[PDB]
Amino acid sequence: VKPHLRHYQVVGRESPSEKNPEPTVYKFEVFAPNFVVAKSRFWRMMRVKNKVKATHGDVLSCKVVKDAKLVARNYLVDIAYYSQRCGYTRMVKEFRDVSKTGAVSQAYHDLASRHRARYHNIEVLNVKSIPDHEVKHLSIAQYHAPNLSFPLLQRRTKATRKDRAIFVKKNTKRAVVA
Amino acid sequence: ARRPSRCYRFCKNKPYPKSRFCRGVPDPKIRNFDIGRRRATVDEFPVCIHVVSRELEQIASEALEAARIQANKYMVKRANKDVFHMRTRAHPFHVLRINKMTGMRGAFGKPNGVCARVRIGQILLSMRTKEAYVPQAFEALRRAKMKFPGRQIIVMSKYWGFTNILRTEYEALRDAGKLEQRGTHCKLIAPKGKITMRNVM
Amino acid sequence: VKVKSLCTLQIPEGVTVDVKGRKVTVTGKRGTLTKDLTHLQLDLRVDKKNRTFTVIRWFGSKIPIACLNTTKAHVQNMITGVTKGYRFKVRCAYAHFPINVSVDGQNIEVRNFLGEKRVRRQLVPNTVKVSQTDPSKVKDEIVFDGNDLEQVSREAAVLHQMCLVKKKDIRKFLDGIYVQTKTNIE
Amino acid sequence: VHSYGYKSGTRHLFAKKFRKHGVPSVSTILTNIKVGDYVDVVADSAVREGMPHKYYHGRTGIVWNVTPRGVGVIINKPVRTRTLRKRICVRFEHVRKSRCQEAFKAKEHQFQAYLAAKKAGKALPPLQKSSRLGGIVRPKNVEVLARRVADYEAMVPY
RNA sequence: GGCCAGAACCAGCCCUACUGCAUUAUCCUGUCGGGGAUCAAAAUCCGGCGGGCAACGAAGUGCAAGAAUCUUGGGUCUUGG
RNA sequence: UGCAAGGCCGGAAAGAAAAGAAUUAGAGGCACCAAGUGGGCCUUCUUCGGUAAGCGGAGCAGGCGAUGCGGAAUGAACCGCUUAGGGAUAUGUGGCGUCAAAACUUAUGGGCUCAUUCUCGAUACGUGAAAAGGGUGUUGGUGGAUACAGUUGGACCAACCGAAUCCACCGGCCCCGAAAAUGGAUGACGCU
RNA sequence: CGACGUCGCUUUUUGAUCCUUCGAUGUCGGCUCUUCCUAACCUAGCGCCGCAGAAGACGCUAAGGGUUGGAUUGUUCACCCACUGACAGGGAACGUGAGCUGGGUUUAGACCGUCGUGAGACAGGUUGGUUUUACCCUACUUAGCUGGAAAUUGCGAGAA
């Protein structure tokens, strides 16, 4: 399935005024389901860092950063999340994926399952593709073997939806109730 | 006897101090707020360890006194009494009332005890010691917080002892004449005021 | 998870190992043994030409991976059983009351344990041979012989558990039946 | 217990600001109040003569009566389902000239000035353009907005 | 026949089919150097330079107004003829 | 002839410009005659007494009372929606293994979890069941340390032996802490 | 085992409240009879001990079974005598009054003390003081008749 988060680049600034006639222009990287969530994350970042509110600023661009060609890669995702018990927890994780968006989307699922962290409590500091020789985790490095092979065991293969049946003769494929 | 502390845990009331309106208040169970070598200079104890509160609640003076006795007993046993200085940073200024059961009529209670109202992130105990006795301080504060209701965390301070100067910069600022010693704490000298024999650096 | 974890075992010349549906049969001289490992969910291979036994766990976490080293030990014990056998030596230790052990064919009788009048009986399965050493060599010794280590043990352990002191300070009352030597028949 | 006198609950309402104590100045005495003016009714606690009731403090009304030392002010007051026009009698020290129509008066005078300038061949001032329109932006400096590791360590005290 | 049923057509609704404009560059390629791991490679990766449209139904990205007449779609016992 | 007041006569009036520069299911005022009611209660935030209470007492605003309907199995007050008599098409809250309409157990989605007599979990409101503390259960992180290491065998320290270990701390799910009276309750079966 | 502290559980105590009942839900105790709980006294196993033996302490699984006779008191409690393997603690509308009993409590009679001018009062003492109704429906205990698999029908057809 395709990743549920897209790579957005938001460009914006404080609206010019008499005090600030030439405001600084900021470029922001964020992974969001849509550009409305992307703009919301941008103004939150602007408010908590540059002390600039959305009501006093404008967005120059909210385009999507296109994914590269799909190649099996190692992605180093710098990610952090907030919990009441422990404040902010920042971790660096390695993932196998074919795109930056897929790696970040897989990172959000990983944080949601292993640490019960939802989207709005999570900040993605950085994501990048790294070579095989800089991978530290063995669970990721095992996929760099020049001759990596494995069988497919314990696999539940479902029939085509059109051809699924409720009752089938025991040692045959003839459908009795379908 | 004494009522269980679970009846007075949450900060449900407005602050109720001992004043000219609230008379007949018993004395707090904790009177010594500084144990160990309190007279030691700031140079002597560089390491500071804090017990920080994680909840908004009330801590009775009985629990505060119990914690400092336990912490003092452990340090004296597993170290010396002259290698640490501990300060209790919570003061029981909130007076608790008891109805002391005419039912429910005219039920405003009489003073019963005192407790400290603590917030999230507030420091409860601070231990000043040398780097050699750090493991003893952590165990002493771990035992002391078992006397405390609620959740607390033991953390290592980034500052030098009981001062507001970073551990990484105290010695350099001390070697230059930029620090004024004032007993347990010290103040960084500012280039303000008249030109005197102080504030020249 | 870990993609591939495996363990390897070398099979001696005189013993053959067969695997079929997680059912391991080890045949050599002095007998043969069979183990049912259908509860393990592992990948068992035997290289007949190279005399190697391999157990593989694919995409396993810690719990499934802990089973492949257990599997190798079980097959190794079977290999040793059909080449050297297993011999457990048992000694009856007592302070005052002699422990009279009578060993008939596959039947063990224990009498006068701590002076009790009750007789303790145990029926040894036919796969394990029980013999009593002549007292002239070593006093009150019982020897269990068999191919299966699992069966040879718990025949001595059952003997040990039958002669247990009750309602007394076991630190002081040390009477009992204890295994002393675990070795091989050949 | 609690009572309802004339000046009940006015501990902070009828008090001077910090370091601003004192009786009213000459400019208050020299200020002219006329019938029909707009006034803010702000009680002066240093003049305990002709003070308004605590309700009318901070209310703006219309002068209906002028007397040697006093000012009559009509003040709207909501009671149940309607608003009553209450006439209060206060000393002149407790009223200030209201600037509530200053923006409207300037708007009227600007229109007269614009009309006169338009009438006789004068150059009208240029109309202001809206700031919400589009346009090209040339940024002199561009910076990256991101969350850094230093941000998380800086919010931890001790 | 003022009864039952089925097909035709109309008008009105309700559905589904058929899609254009804009945008990509943290991108696409070749080559050089580095780096990598191999029996030896290649690749993942980082730089320099030169070209550029990833254009197969390119993208699952912003907006789409495409006359169901052309080119005989479906329903209406959810309307009336 | 200046100020104050009441008038009269004239002039001008984007009928209120431009700068984000209002909007309106926007007929305003004035009366008369009268009914029921004057026990309330519940929730959101604020809040006083009380150890607390399905306890007593207040502020703002919704609601029940007076109101059903569609949901949370069941409930005056929670969620949705508020109601002429009917059809069609879409939804809301809530759901799609059976009971029971919907994935005839959807995907060509990723992880985590095993719970032996109140019997893991699937309870918004609903505390309408749980704490301090603890776990070498498993799965994740942070920071240090060592690398021909660490564990063994061999002679309280150093050598063979040929790979990655161990030290503290912080999470997720599970487990222990966890005892009441008729036989019983994620609604039931059951589900891994 | 556990001071100074601290976190809980329970509803076999009292208190707090005032939601139900005031055109009425029969009040304490005992007797009788059944059942349930476990925080386990005895009985079955099993750990550990400052565990030599004997006698015991502490703890775990387990409520299947058992848990007494009497003097005083209306008593519940309490206390003592005695037996025993042991004489554990509790719930069931403080189980159980159309099952009993009626000693107490709490009408009217009467005595005493204290109080009250008095009539009278007293969670002070004392004595005497009507305990009604089942033939209805369920429940339970026994006791009879009797159809019915499409659980009365379909002809609707399934054999351990």
Ligand SMILES: C#CCOc1ccc(C[C@H]2NC[C@H](O)[C@H]2OC(C)=O)cc1
């Ligand atoms: C004196 C005294 C205290 O003891 C009682 C004992 C019984 C009762 C009767 C009430 N019990 C429930 C109902 O409200 C009433 O039933 C009837 C039949 O009236 C009241 C008090």
Ligand SMILES: [K+]
């Ligand atoms: K604590």
Ligand SMILES: [K+]
């Ligand atoms: K009653």
Ligand SMILES: [K+]
């Ligand atoms: K026993």
Ligand SMILES: [K+]
């Ligand atoms: K009496």
Ligand SMILES: [Mg+2]
């Ligand atoms: Mg208690």
Ligand SMILES: [Mg+2]
């Ligand atoms: Mg309060």
Ligand SMILES: [Mg+2]
């Ligand atoms: Mg005030």
Ligand SMILES: [Mg+2]
């Ligand atoms: Mg004021």
Ligand SMILES: [Mg+2]
């Ligand atoms: Mg290149």
Ligand SMILES: [Mg+2]
């Ligand atoms: Mg170029």
Ligand SMILES: [Mg+2]
């Ligand atoms: Mg698609």
Ligand SMILES: [Mg+2]
């Ligand atoms: Mg068309």
Ligand SMILES: [Mg+2]
């Ligand atoms: Mg039509």
Ligand SMILES: [Mg+2]
């Ligand atoms: Mg029609």
Ligand SMILES: [Mg+2]
């Ligand atoms: Mg309008």
